[PDB]
Design a binder for this molecule. Structure first.
Ligand code: PBC
Ligand code: CL
Length: 363
């Protein structure tokens, strides 16, 4: 019958439409993986000025969802024995020898516990190798490495940069030429080709100022991916079924499904952040709140890394000045969701859409 497809469209429309109106989101793409099948729902405008509609092939900036791609490259380096999580950061970049990175692990960098690396590089650090080098050489922890989580682009950015160094190649080249092809992603870019530019949505900020992300230090590692809802769902499906990939890449994905500590209801992996499932909407919002993102939190370290599988929801938010993304999946239910928008609208609202959909797929 037409009942199941009708029900799914009604569910997704009911979740998305009010949130788009309430947050003045010009365009939004949803992709859902359910029972081994993909479903796409596209809303609104990729560009208001030229009237181009969003489709499942529209490219959006995913911001910090890129950190899960970075984590996957690191997982490849780890499981190929090029680095270990307990390595000191300065073991992988001679410029860092003699700095405080002699006493900071790769795990600390990956999971934001290096001791207070800030949310963003300061504005004094441009996209320039020497400036980035000098920034890390001079940086000193505010508190002991391993003790407090402070969500940070320079932290996990350095993790990605060092993973690339451990592999002997630039980060951007490894992602383009090795990671994206291994994952079957042909509509996923760090640097959008001219031939794909017509698919790149406009981002919108205050007064509908147009915002596509400009260059910044460790942008590729931290926030550089532009992808479609369909390709990002392919990446979620790879995460749901790592065993379907060639074994080196299966292991790389599995490395991103291991939790190291808890803060509140959240268990922190490499890139992915996990919750028990079911959990209340308010708690999932709180785990993705502004205080969680902006304030230091003492961690509760696990005695052994925990498998992020089964009755859990793995997620990641991502933002740029013009865009707001959210991805979530439930390993033990073979359920995946991507929500890509061309306004940076609050995480609470992204989670509201997702929760309504995921809860309605449960019921
Ligand atoms: B991410 O979208 O959460 C992000 C964090 C810091 C700097 C850039 C991106
Ligand atoms: Cl930054």
């Amino acid at each position: 019958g037409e009942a199941p497809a009708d029900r799914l469209k009604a569910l997704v429309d009911a979740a998305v439409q009010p949130v788009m109106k309430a947050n003045d989101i010009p365009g939004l793409a949803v992709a859902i993986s359910l029972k081994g099948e993909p479903h796409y729902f596209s809303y609104g405008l990729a560009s208001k000025e030229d009237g181009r509609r969003v489709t499942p092939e529209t490219l959006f900036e995913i911001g910090s969802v890129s950190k899960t791609f970075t984590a996957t490259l690191a997982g490849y380096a780890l499981t190929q024995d090029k680095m270990r999580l307990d390595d000191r950061a300065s073991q992988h970049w001679p410029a860092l020898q003699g700095s405080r990175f002699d006493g900071i692990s790769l795990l600390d960098l990956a999971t934001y516990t290096a001791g207070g690396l800030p949310l963003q590089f300061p504005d004094s650090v441009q996209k320039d190798q020497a400036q980035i080098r000098d920034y890390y050489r001079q940086w000193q922890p505010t508190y002991a490495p391993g003790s407090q989580r402070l969500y940070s682009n320079p932290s996990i950015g350095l993790f990605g940069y060092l993973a690339a160094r451990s592999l002997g190649q630039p980060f951007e080249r490894l992602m383009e030429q090795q990671v994206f092809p291994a994952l079957g992603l042909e509509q996923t870019h760090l640097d959008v080709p001219e031939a794909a530019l017509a698919q790149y949505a406009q981002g919108y900020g205050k007064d509908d100022r147009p915002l596509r992300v400009g260059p910044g230090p460790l942008d590729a590692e931290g926030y550089g991916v532009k992808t479609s809802a369909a390709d990002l769902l392919r990446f979620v499906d790879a995460n749901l079924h790592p065993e379907r990939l060639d074994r080196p890449w299966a292991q790389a994905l599995d490395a991103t499904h291991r939790g190291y500590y808890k803060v509140g209801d959240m268990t922190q992996g490499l890139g992915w952040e996990a919750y028990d499932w079911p959990i209340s909407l308010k708690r999932l919002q709180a785990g993705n709140s502004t205080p969680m993102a902006l304030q230091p939190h003492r961690i509760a370290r696990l005695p052994a890394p925990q498998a992020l599988e089964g009755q859990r929801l793995l997620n990641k938010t991502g933002s740029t000045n013009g865009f707001g993304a959210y991805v979530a999946f439930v390993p033990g239910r073979d359920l995946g969701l991507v929500i890509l928008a061309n306004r940076n609208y609050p995480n609470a609202e992204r989670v509201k859409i997702a929760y309504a959909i995921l809860s309605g797929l449960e019921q």
